[PDB]
RNA sequence: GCGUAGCAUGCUACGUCAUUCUCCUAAGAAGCUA
RNA sequence: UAAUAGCUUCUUAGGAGAAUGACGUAGCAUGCUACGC
C-alpha cells in the first residue's frame, strides 16, 4: 500500500555566512520508521566501510583525513585535484535522478523483497519524499520534486546522485571527443564500445561495465560526501578530453539539472602537496607530525571565532557553565597552530587561554558558593596542547 | 535556591524556619539572629534537622555537617564539623556574608506579637528593607490571628432565611459582618469536605443570623463552618521611591486656561511636576481630592491612576471625576469577588484607559505618567509597597491627612498610635512637612468647622460658609445592647426615628455611627442610607445624622468623631454620649 | 576593532528589540531584520554606522519600552 | 589522613616497622605482616567509601552550581541585555549615536525610523523650548549628526504652527510637545 | 542481610570466640573457634552477595515495570488524541458537496487536490502586494476555481482587520503585507 | 617403614574486598560536517 | 517550531573481561615434631 505523508518545513536557527534562510524537511514518523526498516542495513554498511568512494562514517580525527586523501590519490598517473559545486542541489535535483538513487539503494533487496514489494517501497519513497504535501506555515502545498533533506536516506541518496552526475560527465567527455585525434588505441576502442553499449545495446554488458568502472577508478578517482566531491583525475587525459573536466560538469548540470554551475565555485589544484582546496568546509595542509608528513584539516578561523562569540541560547553565554563547549571548539581549531599565518595560529591559543580563564573563574565561583575546592579536578588537561595534538595522531 | 539577606543584601541560602515569613539571612546575620533569640530552626536548600533513622533535633548549635547530611550530637558520622560556629552559621556563600548592627531591631521585629504600640513605632522608623519585612510579617500575623476564631455549627432551621448559629465552647467568636467569610464541613462519617462559601450577619430578635451563600446547599445539623485564610504574598518594591528634584517639568505638559475654578492650585501643580513624588496634607474638606482632578485637568495628556485603600472613598473620587473629567475616558477596576457594591457608571474594568480608578488591593500591574494615592491614613506600608510595585509611574502624588482615622490595626490593643507612625507617608508629612498644604474648608458650614477647629486642629482653619443653624447636638442617654460584639443602641435609634418625622428636610441624611452593628441594623427602622465612620471618610453628603452608640475608647476617639462630623455639607444632627465631647463642640440646644 | 564592534552591537540591539516584542509588528520587524542583516553584511564602517543609527531609532522611538535615563545613568 | 581506620593501619604499620627493625625471627614477623594486611584492607575499604562519598559530594556541588547559575542567567535576560547594549553603545562613541541618545534622554525622540535616503521624511517630537533652541537653527534642524530642512511643525492638537511662533513668549502658551516633520538634506 | 540467619551464625560464632579468648582457652580450641568464625563469616558474605543481586535485580525489575506502565498509559493518551482529531475532521466535512463529487466519480476515487477546490466552503487568499490584490480579488466578490466567492474578512500579516477602503494604491505602503482575505462560497 | 595429630613452605580451585585498565550497553550535556 | 545521517569530546550508571594486591575456605606436594604398631 502507498502511504502519502505530510512533511513540515522548519526554519533552521544556526550560524551561517550568508543571510538566506535555511529550511529543513521534518518528515513524519510513519515514513521515517519504515524507511529506516528498509534502508538502515545498507546505510550502516556504507558508514562502516573504510577506503571506498563514499566517505560516510569516516572520521577526520586520528589520521582519518590523511587516510581519505591517500585513498583518493589511488595510483593516478598525472594527478590534478578537482572540486565542483551543485547550485540549489536539493531543490533542482530532477525526479528521475532521485528515483535512480532510490532504485540503486534498493538493489540490495534481491532476496528479501519481491518485485512488487520493491515497487511499492519505491512508490512510498516518492509519495513521502519526492512529491509530497508540504506543511509551510499552517498550509499544505504540493512539492514539485527534488529531494527533501529530512528523509532517512538523504546523504546516501545524495551520494548516489553525485556519483551519477560524475559518471555522466565522464561519459559525455569521452563521447564528445573526436576519435580520430585519440592517439591511445585502447581509449579509442573504449569509446567505440561505450557508444555500442549506450545506443546499440539493450541488454547490460557486464564486461564493459566492469571495464569502464576500472577506467574511471584508474583515471578519475573520487571521494564523495553527499554533495562534496574531491577528484584526483589524470590531467593529461582530461586535457585530451578522455576524462571529465569542469566544463563537462557544467554542461551536464546545464542539460540534466537545469542549473548553471559557475566556475567561480569549482576549484582545481595542480599541486598535490597542498591537498584539496576545500572538502566538507575544511581546508587541508601538509604538516610534519612526529617524523612523517600528514594531511590535517583546518577550518575557517572566522567560523570558530563566530561559534565562540555568537550562540543560540542565553545560557551558552555564561562560559563557566559550558567549558566542554570551548573544549570541542579548540579540538576543531587545533590544526590552525600549524598554519604559516600567525593570526590563524593564535585562534587555538586564544581558545586555550579562554578555557583556562573559564576554569579559574569557575573555581573562584565554586569556592565562593561554598568554602571548599573540588577534590578531583581533571580540567588541567584542556589547556595543554597535547590533549588536542593526540586528537590528530593515527594511534587510535 | 539562593537569595539575598534582608538586613544586609548579601548573598545567602539560609532562612529562619521559626519566622512566619521565612526570610533569607546571610551567615553572620543568621548567627546573630539565632544565637540571641528563641528562634533555633534554619532552612537551607535542605532543612537543618538531624538525618538519623528517627531523630528530631533542630537547634543549630547542636548539629553538625557529617558525612553528607546534617546530623545531631550523638547521631553524627565520626567525622564532624559543627554548623553553628566560628561566629557564623554554615551556608552557601559563606565567606562573602557581611553582617550588620540591625540584628538588634530584626530580633524585635521577628519576636514581637504586634500587641503593644511600640512594635509599630519600631516597625516604621527602621531601615528600608525592615520596613518591608515588618509590614509583611504584620500582615501574616493579622491573617494567622483568624485561625483562633471559634468553629461554628448550626443549631437548627425554623426559618430558611435566617440561620441559627452555635459557636464551639471554649473559643472566641468572630464578629458578624461582610468582611469575614466561612467555608464548611460535614465531618460526620461521611464527607469531611467543604460545603460552600457562606457569610453571616446578626438578627435583631433572639439569636439568629440572616446568612448568605455562594451556592444553595442546606446544612443537616452536623454541617458547620470555619473561617478560611488569606495567604499573604511577598513584597519587594520600596515603600517610597527615592525623591529627585528636577530643574523643570519632565514628562508632563501644562494646559491652556485649565479652568476658572482650579486657577488657585496652579503653583502646586507645577511643584508636583518638578518633584518625583509630592505630598498634600490638609484638613478634611479643603480641596484635597479636588486637587487631584484639577491636576488631571492641568495635565490632560497624562495617563493617571487613582488609588485608595477604601472602596467608599475611591467611589466618591469616581463620582467627582464623573462630575468634572470627561466620562468617556475613565474606568473602574473591581476585584473578582467584589464584596462591596462598587461604582458602575463608567466602562468598568478596562485597565488600559487614560484615567483608571482602583483600590490598592486590586491594582493591576501597569504604567502611568502620574499615580495619585488618596487617603494615605487608611494605607499601611503594605499598601504603599503594593502600589509602588504594581504601578510604574513618572510622578507620584500622595494626598491625605494624618488627623483622620488610621488603618484598623486589629492586633493593636495596648496604647495609642501617634499619627507620625501610621505609615511612611504620614511620617514624612509630620516630620519635615507636606510639600503642598491648603487649610481652608470649602465643604462644611461655619458651625461644624468652627467646632472641629477646636477638637483636632489647634485653631488653624478659617473656612467659607454661613452657619445655617442646622447643626444639632442632642442629649440622650442611649442604653446599651452589646449584641453583635459591636454595640447597638436601640433607644438612640428610637430618638432618631421619633425625630426624623419632625424634620421634613432631613429625610435623606446619611446615618453615621462608629459601630457597624447599629449602622447596619438601622436600615429597617428609618430606611436612610447607612455608613460606618471608617468608610464614610472621603465622601460628602448634604445631611448627616451621627449617633455616638456607646461610651468607649473607640467611639469617643477625637479623630474618628472629627472625620465623622466633617462629611456634612449644609447641616448635621449628632447625638452624643460623653459629657465632655458634647461640651467641647458648640451646637444648638434641643 | 571598530567594524566588528558595530556588527556585535547590532546583534545585541536586535536581541533587545525582539525582547521588546517588536516581532509582533511585521512591518517594523522586517525593517529591523533588514537593517541588522545589512549591518552584518557590511564592508564599510560609515554605512554600518548609518544603519545602526536607523536601527537604534526603532529602540528610541518606543517611549514606554525602555528607561533611557536609568540605562544611561548606569554608565 | 585523620580518620579512625587510618589510625589503626598507621599504628599497625609503625609496629611492623619497629618489629622489622628488630626482625629476629620469624612467626611474630609473619603474624605482624598478616595483621598489617588485615588492618590495611579495612582501612582501604573505609578510604574507598570515603572517596565514593566525596565524589558524590563533588557531583552534587557541580550540579547545584549549574542549576543555580542557569536559572539566574535565564531569569535576568532583559535587563542584562539592555545594560550590555548600552555599554556597547557607549563604547562605540559615535557622534550620531551619542547625539540621538542624548536627545532621547531629554525626550526628543523620533516617531519613525530615521531614514538614510536623501530627501526622506523624519518626524521627531520636541518637548520643550530648550530642546528646540539647540537643535533648530532657523529652518535647519540638526539631528543624528545630519542636517534636515524643517517642513511642518504641529502640536498635540495637530494644529500647524509657523516657525515664527516658536519663541520665549508665545510658546509658553502653545500645546507642547511640538512634532517637527523634516526632510533629509 | 541481617534478616537471614547467616548474620546470627556469624554473631554467635564471634561471641563464642571472644568469650573463649577472654577466658584464656587453649591454642587448639582458639584455632578451632577461629576456623568456625571464618567459615561463618564466609557464609555470611556469600549470602550477602546473593542479597546484593536480589536487591539490584529487584530495583531493575521495578524500574522496568514503572517504565512499561508509563509507556502504556502514554499510549492510550495519544490513541485518544488521534481518535478525537480524526472524528473532529470528520465533523468538519462538507458532506453534501463531497458526496456529490464522490458519486460523480466512476470508481469512487477522486484526486485529493480537487477535494477543497470543489467542496471547501471557505477560501483564504494570501496576497503579497497591491497589484496582485487588484488582479485577483478586487471588489467584494470575485471568481476563483470556476466559483463565486464573497469577501467576508480581510486581515493583514499582523492579524489585524483591514477594511476594503484601506486597500488602495496610496494606502498600500501603510498596510502590513501580505494580506489574508477570507471569502465564503456564494 | 606405616597410620593419626600439630606447625611451617609451596601450587591449584572457589568466595569476598581494594586499586588500575579494556570493552559492551544505557542515559545526559555539547561541538563540527553534509 | 526545531529534520536525516556521520564523527568527536565530556559526564553518570550497569554488565562482562583482564591485571595486581589482600583475606578466608577446600584440595594436592614437601620439611620438622608428638603418640601407636
Ligand atoms: C564535607 C564537604 C567538604 C569537605 C570539608 O571538610 N569542609 C569543611 C568546611 C570548610 N571550611 C574550611 C571553611 C571550615 C561539604 C562542604 C560544602 C558542602 C555542601 C553545601 O554546603 C550544601 C549542598 C546542598 C545540600 O545541602 C546537599 C549537600 C551539599 C552538596 C553539601 C555537601 C557537603 O557537606 C559539602 C561539599
Ligand atoms: N476652588 C474651589 N472653589 C469652590 N469650591 C471648591 C473648590 N475646591 C473645592 N471645592 C469644594 O470643596 C469640596 C472639597 O472636596 P474634597 O476635595 O473631596 O475634600 P477632601 O479632599 O477633604 O475629601 C468639594 O466638594 C468642592 O465642592
Ligand atoms: Mg478628599
Ligand atoms: Zn527568626
Ligand atoms: Zn546578612
Ligand atoms: Zn540526631
Amino acid at each position: 500500500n502507498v502511504i502519502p505523508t505530510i512533511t513540515q518545513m522548519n526554519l533552521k536557527y544556526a550560524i551561517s555566512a550568508k543571510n538566506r534562510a535555511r529550511t529543513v524537511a521534518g518528515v513524519s514518523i510513519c515514513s521515517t520508521m519504515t524507511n529506516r526498516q528498509f534502508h538502515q542495513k545498507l546505510l550502516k554498511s556504507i558508514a562502516a566501510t573504510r577506503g571506498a568512494t563514499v566517505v560516510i562514517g569516516t572520521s577526520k580525527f586520528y589520521g582519518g583525513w590523511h587516510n581519505m586523501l591517500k585513498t583518493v590519490y589511488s595510483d593516478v598517473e598525472n594527478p590534478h585535484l578537482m572540486g565542483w559545486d551543485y547550485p540549489k542541489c536539493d531543490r533542482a535535483m530532477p525526479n528521475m535522478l532521485r528515483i535512480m538513487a532510490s532504485l540503486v539503494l534498493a538493489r540490495k533487496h534481491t532476496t528479501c523483497c519481491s518485485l512488487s514489494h520493491r515497487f511499492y517501497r519505491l512508490a512510498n519513497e516518492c509519495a513521502q519524499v519526492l512529491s509530497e504535501m508540504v506543511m509551510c506555515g499552517g498550509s499544505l502545498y504540493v512539492k514539485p520534486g527534488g529531494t527533501s533533506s529530512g528523509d532517512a536516506t538523504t546523504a546516501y541518496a545524495n551520494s548516489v546522485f553525485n556519483i551519477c552526475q560524475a559518471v555522466t560527465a565522464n561519459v559525455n567527455a569521452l563521447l564528445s571527443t573526436d576519435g580520430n585525434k585519440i592517439a591511445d588505441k585502447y581509449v579509442r576502442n573504449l569509446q567505440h564500445r561505450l557508444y555500442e553499449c549506450l545506443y546499440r545495446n539493450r541488454d547490460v554488458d557486464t564486461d564493459f561495465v566492469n571495464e569502464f568502472y576500472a577506467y574511471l577508478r584508474k583515471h578519475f578517482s573520487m571521494m564523495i560526501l553527499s554533495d562534496d566531491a574531491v577528484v584526483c583525475f589524470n590531467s593529461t587525459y582530461a586535457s585530451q578530453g578522455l576524462v571529465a573536466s569542469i566544463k563537462n560538469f557544467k554542461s551536464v548540470l546545464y542539460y540534466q539539472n537545469n542549473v548553471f554551475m559557475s566556475e567561480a565555485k569549482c576549484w582545481t589544484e595542480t599541486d598535490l602537496t597542498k591537498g584539496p582546496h576545500e572538502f566538507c568546509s575544511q581546508h587541508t595542509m601538509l604538516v610534519k607530525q612526529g617524523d612523517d608528513y600528514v594531511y590535517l584539516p583546518y577550518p575557517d578561523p572566522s567560523r570558530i571565532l563566530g561559534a565562540g562569540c555568537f550562540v543560540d541560547d542565553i545560557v551558552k553565554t555564561d562560559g563557566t557553565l559550558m567549558i566542554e563547549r570551548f573544549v570541542s571548539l579548540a579540538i576543531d581549531a587545533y590544526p590552525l597552530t600549524k598554519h604559516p599565518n600567525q593570526e590563524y595560529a593564535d585562534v587555538f591559543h586564544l581558545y586555550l587561554q579562554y578555557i583556562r580563564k573559564l576554569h579559574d573563574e569557575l573555581t573562584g565561583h565554586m569556592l565562593d558558593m561554598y568554602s571548599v575546592m573540588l577534590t578531583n579536578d581533571n580540567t588541567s588537561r584542556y589547556w595543554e596542547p597535547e590533549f588536542y595534538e593526540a586528537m590528530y595522531t593515527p594511534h587510535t | 535556591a539562593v537569595g539575598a539577606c534582608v538586613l544586609c543584601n548579601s548573598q545567602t541560602s539560609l532562612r529562619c524556619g521559626a519566622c512566619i515569613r521565612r526570610p533569607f539571612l546571610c551567615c553572620k546575620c543568621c548567627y546573630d539572629h539565632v544565637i540571641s533569640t528563641s528562634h533555633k530552626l534554619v532552612l537551607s536548600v535542605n532543612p537543618y534537622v538531624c538525618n538519623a533513622p528517627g531523630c528530631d533535633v533542630t537547634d543549630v548549635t547542636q548539629l553538625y555537617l557529617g558525612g553528607m547530611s546534617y546530623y545531631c550530637k550523638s547521631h553524627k558520622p565520626p567525622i564532624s564539623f559543627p554548623l553553628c560556629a566560628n561566629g557564623q552559621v554554615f551556608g552557601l556563600y559563606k565567606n562573602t556574608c557581611v553582617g550588620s548592627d540591625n540584628v538588634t531591631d530584626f530580633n524585635a521585629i521577628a519576636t514581637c506579637d504586634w500587641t503593644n504600640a511600640g512594635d509599630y513605632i519600631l516597625a516604621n522608623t527602621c531601615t528600608e528593607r525592615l520596613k518591608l519585612f515588618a509590614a509583611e510579617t504584620l500582615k501574616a500575623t493579622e491573617e494567622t490571628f483568624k485561625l483562633s476564631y471559634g468553629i461554628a455549627t448550626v443549631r437548627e432551621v425554623l426559618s430558611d432565611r435566617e440561620l441559627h448559629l452555635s459557636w464551639e465552647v471554649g473559643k472566641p467568636r468572630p464578629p458578624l459582618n461582610r468582611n469575614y467569610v466561612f467555608t464548611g464541613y460535614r465531618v460526620t462519617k461521611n464527607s469531611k469536605v467543604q460545603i460552600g462559601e457562606y457569610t453571616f450577619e446578626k438578627g435583631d430578635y433572639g439569636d439568629a443570623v440572616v446568612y448568605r451563600g455562594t451556592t444553595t446547599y442546606k446544612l443537616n445539623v452536623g454541617d458547620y463552618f470555619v473561617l478560611t485564610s488569606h495567604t499573604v504574598m511577598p513584597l519587594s518594591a520600596p515603600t517610597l521611591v527615592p525623591q529627585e528634584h528636577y530643574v523643570r517639568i519632565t514628562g508632563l505638559y501644562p494646559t491652556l486656561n485649565i479652568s476658572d475654578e482650579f486657577s488657585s492650585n496652579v503653583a502646586n501643580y507645577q511643584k508636583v511636576g518638578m518633584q518625583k513624588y509630592s505630598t498634600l496634607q490638609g484638613p478634611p474638606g479643603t480641596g484635597k481630592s479636588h486637587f487631584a482632578i484639577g491636576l488631571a485637568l492641568y495635565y490632560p495628556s497624562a495617563r493617571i491612576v487613582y488609588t485608595a485603600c477604601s472602596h467608599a472613598a475611591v467611589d466618591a473620587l469616581c463620582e467627582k471625576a464623573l462630575k468634572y473629567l470627561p466620562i468617556d475616558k475613565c474606568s473602574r477596576i473591581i476585584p473578582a469577588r467584589a464584596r462591596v457594591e462598587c461604582f458602575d457608571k463608567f466602562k468598568v474594568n478596562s485597565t488600559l484607559e487614560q484615567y483608571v480608578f482602583c483600590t490598592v488591593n486590586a491594582l493591576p500591574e501597569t504604567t502611568a505618567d502620574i499615580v495619585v494615592f488618596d487617603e494615605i491614613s487608611m494605607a499601611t506600608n503594605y499598601d504603599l509597597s503594593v502600589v509602588n510595585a504594581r504601578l510604574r509611574a513618572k510622578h507620584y502624588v500622595y494626598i491625605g491627612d494624618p488627623a483622620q482615622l488610621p488603618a484598623p490595626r486589629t492586633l493593636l490593643t495596648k496604647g495609642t498610635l501617634e499619627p507620625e507612625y501610621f505609615n511612611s507617608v504620614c511620617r514624612l508629612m509630620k516630620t519635615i512637612g507636606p510639600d503642598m498644604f491648603l487649610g481652608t474648608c470649602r465643604r462644611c458650614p461655619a458651625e461644624i468647622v468652627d467646632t472641629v477647629s477646636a477638637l483636632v486642629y489647634d485653631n488653624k482653619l478659617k473656612a467659607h460658609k454661613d452657619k445655617s443653624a442646622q447643626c444639632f447636638k442632642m442629649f440622650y442617654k442611649g442604653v446599651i445592647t452589646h449584641d453583635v460584639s459591636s454595640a447597638i443602641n436601640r433607644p438612640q435609634i428610637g430618638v432618631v426615628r421619633e425625630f426624623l418625622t419632625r424634620n421634613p428636610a432631613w429625610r435623606k441624611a446619611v446615618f453615621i455611627s462608629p459601630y457597624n452593628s447599629q449602622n447596619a441594623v438601622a436600615s429597617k427602622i428609618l430606611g436612610l442610607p447607612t455608613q460606618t465612620v471608617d468608610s464614610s471618610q472621603g465622601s460628602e453628603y448634604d445631611y448627616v445624622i451621627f449617633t455616638q452608640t456607646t461610651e468607649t475608647a473607640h467611639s469617643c476617639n477625637v479623630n474618628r468623631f472629627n472625620v465623622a462630623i466633617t462629611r456634612a455639607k449644609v447641616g448635621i444632627l449628632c447625638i452624643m454620649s460623653d459629657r465632655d465631647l458634647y461640651d467641647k463642640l458648640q451646637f444648638t440646644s434641643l | 576593532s571598530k567594524m566588528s564592534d558595530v556588527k556585535c552591537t547590532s546583534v545585541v540591539l536586535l536581541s533587545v528589540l525582539q525582547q521588546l516584542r517588536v516581532e509582533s509588528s511585521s512591518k517594523l520587524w522586517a525593517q529591523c531584520v533588514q537593517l541588522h542583516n545589512d549591518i552584518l553584511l557590511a564592508k564599510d564602517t560609515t554605512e554600518a554606522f548609518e544603519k545602526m543609527v536607523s536601527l537604534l531609532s526603532v529602540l528610541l522611538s518606543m517611549q514606554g519600552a525602555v528607561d533611557i535615563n536609568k540605562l544611561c545613568e548606569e554608565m | 589522613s585523620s580518620l579512625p581506620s587510618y589510625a589503626a593501619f598507621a599504628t599497625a604499620q609503625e609496629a611492623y616497622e619497629q618489629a622489622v627493625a628488630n626482625g629476629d625471627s620469624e612467626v611474630v614477623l609473619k603474624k605482624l605482616k598478616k595483621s598489617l594486611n588485615v588492618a590495611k584492607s579495612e582501612f582501604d575499604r573505609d578510604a574507598a567509601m570515603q572517596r565514593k562519598l566525596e565524589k558524590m559530594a563533588d557531583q552534587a556541588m557541580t550540579q547545584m552550581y549549574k542549576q543555580a547559575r542557569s536559572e539566574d542567567k535565564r531569569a535576568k535576560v532583559t535587563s542584562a541585555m539592555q545594560t550590555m547594549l548600552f555599554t556597547m553603545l557607549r563604547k562605540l562613541d559615535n557622534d550620531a549615536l551619542n547625539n540621538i541618545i542624548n536627545n532621547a534622554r531629554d525626550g526628543c525622540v523620533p516617531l519613525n525610523i530615521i531614514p538614510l535616503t536623501t530627501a526622506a521624511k523624519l518626524m521627531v517630537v520636541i518637548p520643550d523650548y530648550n530642546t528646540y533652541k539647540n537643535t533648530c537653527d532657523g529652518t535647519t534642524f540638526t539631528y543624528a549628526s545630519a542636517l534636515w530642512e524643517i517642513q511642518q511643525v504641529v502640536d498635540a492638537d495637530s494644529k500647524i504652527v509657523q516657525l515664527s511662533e516658536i519663541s520665549m513668549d508665545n510658546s509658553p502658551n502653545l500645546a507642547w510637545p511640538l512634532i517637527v516633520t523634516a526632510l533629509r538634506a
Side-chain angles (χ1 to χ4, degrees), chain B residues 260-265 282-292 316 320 323-324 374-375 399 404 440-444 537-540 566-567 569:
Chain B
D260 40 356
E261 186 178 358
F262 312 94
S263 65
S264 59
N265 330 14
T286 52
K288 295 188 299 292
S289 320
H290 140 308
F291 177 88
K320 208 185 311 302
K323 188 178 63 177
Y324 279 157
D374 193 3
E375 297 302 330
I399 55 185
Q404 327 275 96
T440 291
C441 257
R442 293 297 182 86
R443 153 206 280 159
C444 49
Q537 177 194 202
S539 63
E540 58 266 4
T566 56
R567 323 267 67 81
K569 195 169 302 308

Side-chain angles (χ1 to χ4, degrees), chain B residues 5-10 24-30 97-100:
Chain B
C5 190
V6 283
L7 54 138
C8 69
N9 276 272
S10 176
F24 278 89
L25 281 175
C26 84
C27 301
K28 288 274 189 174
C29 291
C30 191
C97 291
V98 44
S100 171

Side-chain angles (χ1 to χ4, degrees), chain A residues 310-322:
Chain A
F310 305 105
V311 291
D312 55 322
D313 197 0
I314 191 58
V315 294
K316 298 181 179 181
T317 320
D318 197 6
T320 67
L321 265 36
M322 329 279 298

Side-chain angles (χ1 to χ4, degrees), chain B residues 338 340-357:
Chain B
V340 206
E341 279 278 37
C342 299
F343 204 94
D344 305 59
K345 298 181 79 172
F346 331 105
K347 38 166 56 261
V348 104
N349 191 252
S350 188
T351 301
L352 311 181
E353 223 63 26
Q354 174 157 300
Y355 306 102
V356 164
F357 314 85

Side-chain angles (χ1 to χ4, degrees), chain C residues 49 53, chain D residues 94-101 144-145:
Chain C
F49 270 123
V53 170
Chain D
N94 187 25
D95 302 75
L97 295 172
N98 283 18
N99 176 266
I100 66 175
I101 288 176
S145 178

Side-chain angles (χ1 to χ4, degrees), chain A residues 47-242:
Chain A
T49 303
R50 301 293 111 88
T53 301
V54 181
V55 284
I56 298 187
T58 300
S59 182
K60 66 153 175 290
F61 301 100
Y62 308 110
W65 195 262
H66 180 79
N67 294 339
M68 280 188 286
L69 263 53
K70 281 300 178 183
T71 52
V72 184
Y73 311 161
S74 67
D75 201 359
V76 285
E77 281 306 293
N78 307 121
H80 280 15
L81 290 171
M82 187 224 302
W84 59 90
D85 188 70
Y86 290 107
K88 314 294 180 180
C89 177
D90 65 323
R91 282 168 153 83
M93 177 184 303
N95 299 16
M96 281 301 299
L97 300 187
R98 184 62 182 89
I99 291 175
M100 178 272 317
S102 180
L103 288 179
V104 164
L105 263 19
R107 285 206 174 187
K108 305 301 178 180
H109 305 262
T110 45
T111 58
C112 57
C113 295
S114 176
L115 203 76
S116 181
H117 291 357
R118 289 159 75 175
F119 173 74
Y120 273 97
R121 284 302 313 164
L122 168 69
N124 286 276
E125 286 256 351
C126 294
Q128 303 161 350
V129 174
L130 181 62
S131 62
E132 73 218 9
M133 295 294 184
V134 162
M135 177 83 161
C136 185
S139 302
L140 284 177
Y141 307 87
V142 155
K143 209 181 71 177
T147 173
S148 65
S149 295
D151 47 348
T153 156
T154 160
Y156 307 88
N158 270 338
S159 302
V160 180
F161 158 81
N162 195 5
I163 295 181
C164 161
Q165 294 288 78
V167 173
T168 305
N170 289 272
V171 168
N172 291 132
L174 188 48
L175 281 197
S176 65
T177 323
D178 202 68
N180 308 271
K181 309 302 169 55
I182 300 180
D184 196 4
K185 200 176 62 63
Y186 172 80
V187 192
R188 213 184 318 181
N189 185 31
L190 208 156
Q191 179 194 37
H192 202 267
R193 293 184 282 121
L194 180 61
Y195 189 91
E196 292 178 3
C197 293
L198 278 194
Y199 300 107
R200 303 297 187 92
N201 225 241
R202 218 179 306 268
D203 45 353
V204 189
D205 188 9
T206 50
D207 281 330
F208 183 78
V209 173
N210 299 344
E211 196 165 345
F212 195 76
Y213 176 74
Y215 179 83
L216 287 189
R217 280 199 73 96
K218 170 61 183 177
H219 302 284
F220 201 76
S221 183
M222 277 190 288
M223 165 161 71
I224 310 292
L225 188 21
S226 115
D227 46 70
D228 248 316
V230 177
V231 171
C232 195
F233 65 96
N234 194 333
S235 61
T236 299
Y237 275 18
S239 66
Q240 294 168 358
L242 317 175

Side-chain angles (χ1 to χ4, degrees), chain B residues 16 18-19 33 39 106 110:
Chain B
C16 198
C19 285
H33 169 41
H39 288 191
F106 175 80

